[PDB]
Amino acid sequence: DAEFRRDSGYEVHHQK
Amino acid sequence: DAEFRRDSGYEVHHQK
Ligand SMILES: [Zn+2]
Numbered sequence: 001d002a003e004f005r006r007d008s009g010y011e012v013h014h015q016k
Numbered sequence: 017d018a019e020f021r022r023d024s025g026y027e028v029h030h031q032k
Contacts, residue, residue, distance in 0.1 A: 011030075013027070
C-alpha cells in the first residue's frame, strides 16, 4: 500500500 | 550461486 510503497528505501518485504 | 541458491532458507539476495 502506497504510504510504505516508497521509493526512498527499500526492500519492502521487511516492512509492513 | 547454485550451492546456496537453496530452498533451505531463504531470501538469498542478502541472507547466507
Ligand atoms: Zn530481503
